[PDB]
Write a protein that holds these residues in place. Structure first.
Motif, PDB file in Angstrom:
ATOM      1  N   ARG A   1      39.820  55.009  72.271  1.00 52.27           N
ATOM      2  CA  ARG A   1      38.833  56.098  72.310  1.00 52.27           C
ATOM      3  C   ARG A   1      38.155  56.290  70.943  1.00 52.27           C
TER       4      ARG A   1
ATOM      5  N   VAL B   1      34.164  56.199  70.123  1.00 50.87           N
ATOM      6  CA  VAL B   1      33.437  57.201  69.352  1.00 50.87           C
ATOM      7  C   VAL B   1      32.652  56.528  68.220  1.00 50.87           C
TER       8      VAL B   1
ATOM      9  N   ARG C   1      40.862  61.763  63.545  1.00 50.42           N
ATOM     10  CA  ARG C   1      39.685  62.572  63.262  1.00 50.42           C
ATOM     11  C   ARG C   1      39.454  62.695  61.761  1.00 50.42           C
TER      12      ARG C   1
ATOM     13  N   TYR D   1      31.640  63.978  65.834  1.00 52.70           N
ATOM     14  CA  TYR D   1      32.899  63.462  66.347  1.00 52.70           C
ATOM     15  C   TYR D   1      33.453  64.338  67.470  1.00 52.70           C
TER      16      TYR D   1
ATOM     17  N   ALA E   1      31.452  64.084  70.673  1.00 50.92           N
ATOM     18  CA  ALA E   1      31.463  62.764  71.312  1.00 50.92           C
ATOM     19  C   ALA E   1      32.785  62.420  71.976  1.00 50.92           C
ATOM     20  N   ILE E   2      33.887  62.927  71.431  1.00 50.26           N
ATOM     21  CA  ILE E   2      35.197  62.381  71.781  1.00 50.26           C
ATOM     22  C   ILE E   2      35.542  62.428  73.284  1.00 50.26           C
TER      23      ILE E   2
ATOM     24  N   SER F   1      32.933  63.084  75.625  1.00 46.96           N
ATOM     25  CA  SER F   1      31.636  62.925  76.299  1.00 46.96           C
ATOM     26  C   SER F   1      31.697  61.842  77.384  1.00 46.96           C
TER      27      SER F   1
ATOM     28  N   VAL G   1      31.338  58.254  75.831  1.00 50.94           N
ATOM     29  CA  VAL G   1      32.598  57.751  75.272  1.00 50.94           C
ATOM     30  C   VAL G   1      33.618  57.455  76.372  1.00 50.94           C
TER      31      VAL G   1
END
Length: 189
Positions: free
Chosen positions: A75, A79, A110, A123, A126-127, A129, A132
């Motif tokens: 993941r 990202v 992160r 970040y 998006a993580i 979304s 992603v």
């Protein structure tokens, strides 16, 4: 001749070819020392990428099956792709996982992006979304479909798998070039 490529030598056939595959798919893990070298030490990846024919469609997928945070790092890679920060964060991620061994939780992932200069809010948005999420599924499905059980791996046209141990070369400079020449010859098959 010796120079010619042959099945079982520089590459193998996938027993079940994958239709609609990108022309070159690279598989890696941030937990994989050879992957770290291919990316940051020996220029195997960049030599391949710089020397494929114009407009060759390429993909680079992270695998889940290594490391305590394997799928979380898949993941993370999604990202990085989604934000366009692959080159910006990859050295820090390899270093954090393999050298300092300081990436132990999703918070550390992160923080590694943030320390490398990535906008924190980007970040966090998006993580989880859809874009992603779909990149993650794409990577996971490719590992299954291409029957990948070790990295680094590279598969050409959904059919031909590189052999890391099958390259004719005496030096790292020769290795990266020879590996690239093999990829290019397979693309023309």
């Amino acid at each position: 001749s010796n120079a010619d490529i042959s099945e079982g030598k520089q590459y193998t056939n996938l027993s079940k070819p994958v239709a609609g595959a990108p022309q070159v798919v690279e598989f890696f893990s941030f937990y994989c020392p050879h992957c770290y070298q291919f990316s940051e030490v020996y220029k195997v990846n960049s030599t391949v990428e710089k020397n494929v024919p114009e407009n060759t469609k390429m993909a680079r997928y992270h695998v889940d099956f290594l490391g305590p945070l394997g799928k979380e790092m898949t993941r993370a890679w999604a990202v990085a792709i989604a934000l366009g920060v692959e080159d910006q964060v990859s050295p820090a991620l390899f270093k954090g996982i393999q050298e300092t061994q300081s990436i132990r939780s999703v918070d550390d992932i992160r923080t590694t992006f943030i320390n490398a200069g990535v906008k924190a809010e980007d970040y966090d948005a998006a993580i989880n979304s859809f874009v992603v999420n779909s990149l993650v599924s794409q990577q996971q499905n490719a590992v299954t479909d291409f029957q990948i059980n070790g990295v680094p791996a590279m598969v050409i046209d959904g059919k031909y798998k590189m052999k890391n141990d099958g390259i004719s070369a005496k030096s790292p400079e020769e290795y990266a070039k020879a590996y690239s020449d093999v990829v290019n010859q397979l693309l023309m098959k």
